[PDB]
């Protein structure tokens, strides 16, 4: 049966050997193998953004630099000048810094969709595995399942910071845990859930 | 904030996302988008004004790069250059 | 020689496209076993058509049998 | 208050339109005897327009600045006499008769001739299907659950 | 056994008696299709204990307090309260257990025997049943589930439900709580009725 709901009915085009694979698909968007493949592939790499962006939203916060929201607000004055660590960036014009992100990335973005094998798609190897963990292949798949299951968790932490945020604008997302340590039976979502 | 150099910038940086970075999906989507009406192209139906043009067409670089492509990419470069070249003594424009 | 066409008061669909009756259900009456009979089905329906007539002749590939 | 209207019970509008209806309704009443019929069916009037002015004015109602109610239909909660609950009401009754009127048809196409109890009411078979209009929200609802409601595209002919 | 709401009528051909309270009532025909029955049937539970449970915790801290050992408000304002926590939070505590719960119910109604297993210790689950009647942890005394046993419980339920209806009416027109408008009654039995409520 299906592991994400206990007591239910598999789907047809899943039970698959995939990594990370529990038989949820409610709208049946996996019809097709041939976009199967590609959301395999979109998955990982929405995942590894999330999981690479959750210590970039935690630190600055907790090293007293600002949250995530309020160090994107020099960009719109416009004497604005990047900081770093509070050493000021000698390149922080908005425009020098809209270019080259575009430059490079589109070029580092470009090269990694001429690949064709779909199995070397989402995994490739060579500089991005220096260390080398691919020598037993059973424990090759576990760590592909805990690092599915960590970016999943992931990116359902970044949507709570950013709904966490529009509930209280001004906050970050560790002044919300201190605040809900403070007072954990009177602040919680019950306020912004039922309204006054 | 010069535009002498600004220019340049642009049209260079334009000219090399064109011909280094781009170039592959641009003359592969190209080739499956043919203009066409039924089931022959214009040229093929009758319209003598409608024959490409061959000589403008052919180069001597090494992946096909031609005028065509040269103007195509330039006139990017000199869009956003004036693009950045106004946005900067005051502009509050998208 | 083997009767051709089904047996009478079986119940049938309609596929002829111009007909009143498409897509609906009727009653086999009779089938005329002459050969040369273009359209030999006889099939009675509980609704008149525009012009009040309740019956009317079909081919055998007109019709579908519905159990 | 909402869309800058004015309490009816606040409005100076409404109360000049008050005094003006019973001013005119008086000038009738006084060319009469004070026992007479007509002097206490104009006095009734009187009192209803009266009460009828009060009870918009403590009832909540919106008043512009004509000196008129205005209704509220947005679904703010101060306002759901106006229209949501009527409008349930409306929900409620329609239903009941269209659920009786459509088991009555599916009950009475079962006969030789269907047609002939469409111009002639069966009475005994209507008044034991009438009653079950009181629960049709569950019926209408398990039917639908269920695939009676409905006739799939591939069945539908004359 | 098999008895009749209206002596003198028919009992529906759907409704033999296979069922504890069957008494042939079902005027408005709303059974008439069998998978209806099973959902009618598993509904009735639910709305009986749960009106049983409030109708006990609704009457007896009334009389509790009017006895005079305890000062603690009626029914209908207890929800105004000062509590260690405001009610978003007890509504909010509430939804979730409460997902898992009912969730965890409609999949054995949906296929009998499905959820029998406990998630965490692998080693525990719910012998074969009847849907409604669970057992094991649910009946930690182990008493018998007897005929006689499941129409004591439908009936109590049936009362239950049509006593919180009376006070739920009752408090719209009245406003003193269910022992006060009881206590009315026996002072003046011919002159404190529904009719001087209204009049
Ligand atoms: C964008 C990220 C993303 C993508 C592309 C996928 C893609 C996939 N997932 Mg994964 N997944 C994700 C995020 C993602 N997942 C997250 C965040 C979780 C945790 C909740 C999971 C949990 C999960 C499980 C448990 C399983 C999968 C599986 C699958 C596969 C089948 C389902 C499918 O066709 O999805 C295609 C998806 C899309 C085309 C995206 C549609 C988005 C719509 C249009 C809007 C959604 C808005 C959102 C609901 C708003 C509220 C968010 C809030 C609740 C956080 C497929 C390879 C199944 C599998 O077999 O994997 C191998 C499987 O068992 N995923
Ligand atoms: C997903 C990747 C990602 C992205 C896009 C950003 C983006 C940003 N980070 Mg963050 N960061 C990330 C991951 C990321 N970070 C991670 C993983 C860590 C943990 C090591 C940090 C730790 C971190 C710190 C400690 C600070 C930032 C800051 C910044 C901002 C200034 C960057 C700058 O001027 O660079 C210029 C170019 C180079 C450094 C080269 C910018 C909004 C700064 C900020 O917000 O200051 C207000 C800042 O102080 N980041
Ligand atoms: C060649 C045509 C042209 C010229 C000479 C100007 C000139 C001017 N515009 Mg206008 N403008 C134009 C086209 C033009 N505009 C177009 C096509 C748009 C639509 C996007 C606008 C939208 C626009 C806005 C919203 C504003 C101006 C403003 C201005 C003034 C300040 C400079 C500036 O920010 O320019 C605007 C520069 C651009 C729009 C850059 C265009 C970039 C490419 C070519 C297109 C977009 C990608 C100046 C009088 C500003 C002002 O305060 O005026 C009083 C101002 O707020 N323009
Ligand atoms: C597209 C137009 C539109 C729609 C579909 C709605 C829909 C709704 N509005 Mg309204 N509203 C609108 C425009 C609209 N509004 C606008 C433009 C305004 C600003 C003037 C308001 C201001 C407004 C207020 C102030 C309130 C609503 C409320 C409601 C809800 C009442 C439903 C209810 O409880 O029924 C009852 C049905 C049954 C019991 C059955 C409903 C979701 C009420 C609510 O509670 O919303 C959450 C409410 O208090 N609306
Ligand atoms: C059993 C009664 C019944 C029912 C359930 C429906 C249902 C429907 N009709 Mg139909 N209709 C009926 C009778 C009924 N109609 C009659 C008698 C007429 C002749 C005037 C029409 C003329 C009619 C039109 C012209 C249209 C519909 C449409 C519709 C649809 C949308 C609702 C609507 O616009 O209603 C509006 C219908 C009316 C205001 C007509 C009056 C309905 C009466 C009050 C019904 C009850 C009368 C009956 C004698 C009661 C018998 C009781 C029984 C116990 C003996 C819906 C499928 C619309 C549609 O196609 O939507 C997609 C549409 O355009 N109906
Ligand atoms: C449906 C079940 C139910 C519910 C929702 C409540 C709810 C409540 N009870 Mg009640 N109670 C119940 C059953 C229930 N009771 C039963 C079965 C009994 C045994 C007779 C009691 C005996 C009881 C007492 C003695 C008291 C409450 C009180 C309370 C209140 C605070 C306690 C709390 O919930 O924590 C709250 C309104 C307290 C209160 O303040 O009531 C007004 C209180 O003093 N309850
Ligand atoms: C079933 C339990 C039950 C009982 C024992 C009572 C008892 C009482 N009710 Mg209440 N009442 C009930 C149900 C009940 N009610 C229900 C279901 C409703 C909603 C329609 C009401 C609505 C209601 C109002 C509006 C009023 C009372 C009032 C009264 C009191 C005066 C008698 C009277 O006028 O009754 C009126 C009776 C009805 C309106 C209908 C009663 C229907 C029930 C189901 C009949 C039960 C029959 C059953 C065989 C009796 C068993 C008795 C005993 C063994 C439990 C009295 C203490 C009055 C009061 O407060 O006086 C101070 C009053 O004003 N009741
Ligand atoms: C059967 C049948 C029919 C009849 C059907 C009928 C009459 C059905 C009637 C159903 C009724 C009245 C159901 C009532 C259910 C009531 C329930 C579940 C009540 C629950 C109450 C609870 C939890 C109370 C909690 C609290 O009080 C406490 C504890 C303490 C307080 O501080 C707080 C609150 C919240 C107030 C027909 C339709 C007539 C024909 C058909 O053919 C056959
Ligand atoms: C590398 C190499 C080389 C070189 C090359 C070059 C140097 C090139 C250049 C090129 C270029 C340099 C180009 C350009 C182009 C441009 C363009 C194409 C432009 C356009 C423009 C426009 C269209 C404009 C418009 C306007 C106006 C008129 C007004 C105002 C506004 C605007 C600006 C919009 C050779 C040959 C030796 C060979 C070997 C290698
Ligand atoms: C925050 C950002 C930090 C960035 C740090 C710098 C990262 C630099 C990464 C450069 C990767 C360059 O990639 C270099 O190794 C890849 C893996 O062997 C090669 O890729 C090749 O080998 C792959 C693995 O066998 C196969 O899919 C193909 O044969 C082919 O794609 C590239 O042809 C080579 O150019
Ligand atoms: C705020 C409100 C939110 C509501 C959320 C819940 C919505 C629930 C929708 C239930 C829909 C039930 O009806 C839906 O499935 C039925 C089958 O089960 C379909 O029924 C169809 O298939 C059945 C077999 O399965 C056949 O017997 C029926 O003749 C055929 O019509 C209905 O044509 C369809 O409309």
């Known amino acids: ?19 990370g694979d529990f038989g949820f698909d409610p709208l049946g968007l996996a019809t097709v193998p041939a976009n199967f493949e590609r959301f395999k592939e979109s998955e990982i790499y929405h995942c590894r953004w999330a999981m690479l962006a959750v210590p970039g939203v935690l630190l600055p916060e907790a090293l007293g630099l600002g949250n995530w929201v309020k160090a994107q607000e020099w960009a719109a004055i416009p004497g604005g000048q990047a900081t770093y660590l509070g050493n000021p960036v ?16 589109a070029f580092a973005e470009q090269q990694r969709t001429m690949e064709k094998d779909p199995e070397k798609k989402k995994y490739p190897g060579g500089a991005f595995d220096p260390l080398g963990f691919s020598k037993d292949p059973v424990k090759f798949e576990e760590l592909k399942l805990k690092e599915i299951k960590n970016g999943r968790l992931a990116m359902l932490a970044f949507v709570g910071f950013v709904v966490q945020q ?25 306020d912004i859930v039922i309204p006054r | ?8 910038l642009s049209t260079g940086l334009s000219l090399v996302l064109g011909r280094f970075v781009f170039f592959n999906f641009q003359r592969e989507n190209v080739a499956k988008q043919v203009p066409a009406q039924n089931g022959k192209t214009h040229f093929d139906a009758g319209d003598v004004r409608a024959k490409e043009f061959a000589g403008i067409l052919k180069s001597n670089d090494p992946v096909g790069f031609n005028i065509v492509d040269v103007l195509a990419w330039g006139s990017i470069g000199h869009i956003v250059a004036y693009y950045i070249l106004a946005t900067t003594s005051n502009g509050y424009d998208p | 020689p083997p009767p051709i066409g089904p047996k009478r008061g079986t119940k049938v669909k309609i596929l002829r496209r111009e007909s009143y009756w498409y897509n609906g259900t009727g009653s086999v009456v009779t089938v005329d076993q002459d050969p040369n009979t273009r359209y030999p089905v006889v099939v009675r329906f509980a609704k008149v058509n525009y012009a009040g007539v309740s019956t009317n002749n079909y081919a055998l590939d007109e019709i579908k049998e519905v159990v | 208050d909402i869309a800058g209207l004015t309490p009816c019970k606040d409005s100076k509008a409404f109360a000049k339109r008050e005094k003006q209806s019973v001013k005119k309704l008086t000038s009738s009443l006084k060319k009469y005897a004070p026992d007479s019929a007509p002097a206490l069916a104009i006095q009734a009037t009187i009192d209803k327009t009266k009460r009828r002015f009060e009870n918009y004015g403590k009832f909540g109602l919106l008043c512009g600045s004509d000196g008129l109610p205005h209704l509220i239909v947005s679904g703010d909660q101060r306002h759901w006499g106006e229209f949501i609950t009527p409008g349930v009401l409306f929900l409620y ?3 009941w008769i269209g659920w009786v009127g459509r088991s009555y048809l599916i009950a009475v196409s079962g006969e030789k001739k269907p047609a002939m109890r469409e111009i002639i009411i069966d009475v005994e078979l209507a008044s034991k299907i009438i009653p079950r209009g009181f629960i049709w929200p569950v019926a209408a609802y398990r039917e639908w659950i269920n ?12 | 056994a098999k008895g009749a709401w209206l002596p003198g009528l028919a009992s529906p051909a759907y409704l033999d008696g296979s069922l504890a309270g069957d008494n042939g009532f079902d005027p408005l025909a709303l059974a008439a299709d069998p998978e209806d029955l099973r959902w009618f049937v598993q509904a009735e539970l639910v709305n009986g204990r749960w009106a049983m449970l409030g109708v006990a915790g609704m009457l007896i801290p009334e009389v509790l307090t009017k006895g005079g050992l305890l000062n603690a408000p009626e029914w209908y304002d207890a929800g105004k309260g000062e509590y260690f926590a405001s009610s978003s939070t007890l509504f909010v505590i509430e939804f979730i257990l409460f997902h898992y719960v009912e969730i965890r119910r409609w999949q054995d109604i949906k296929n009998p025997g499905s959820v029998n297993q406990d998630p965490i210790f692998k080693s525990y689950s719910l012998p074969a049943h009847e849907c409604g009647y669970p057992g094991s942890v649910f009946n930690p005394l182990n008493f018998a589930p007897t005929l006689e046993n499941k129409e004591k419980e439908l009936a109590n339920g049936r009362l239950a439900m049509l006593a919180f209806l009376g006070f739920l009416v009752q408090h719209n027109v009245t406003g003193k709580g269910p022992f ?11 002159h404190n009725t529904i009719i001087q409520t209204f009049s």
Do not use: C, K
Request: aromatic fraction near 8%; proline fraction near 12%; charged fraction near 15%.
């Open chain 1, 1 to 19: 049966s299906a592991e994400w709901f206990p007591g239910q009915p598999r789907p047809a085009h899943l039970d698959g050997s995939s990594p």
């Open chain 1, 90 to 105: 000698p390149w922080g014009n908005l425009p020098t810094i809209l270019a080259i992100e575009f430059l490079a990335i």
């Open chain 1, 166 to 190: 529009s509930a209280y604008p001004g906050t970050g997302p560790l002044e919300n845990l201190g605040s809900h340590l403070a007072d954990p039976w009177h602040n919680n979502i019950g």
């Open chain 2, 1 to 8: 904030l010069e535009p002498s150099v600004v220019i340049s």
């Open chain 4, 93 to 95: 009754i329609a239903g």
């Open chain 4, 147 to 158: 695939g009676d409601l409905v006739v799939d595209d591939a069945d539908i002919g004359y």
């Open chain 5, 180 to 190: 006060e408008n009881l206590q009315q009654h026996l002072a003046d039995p011919w």
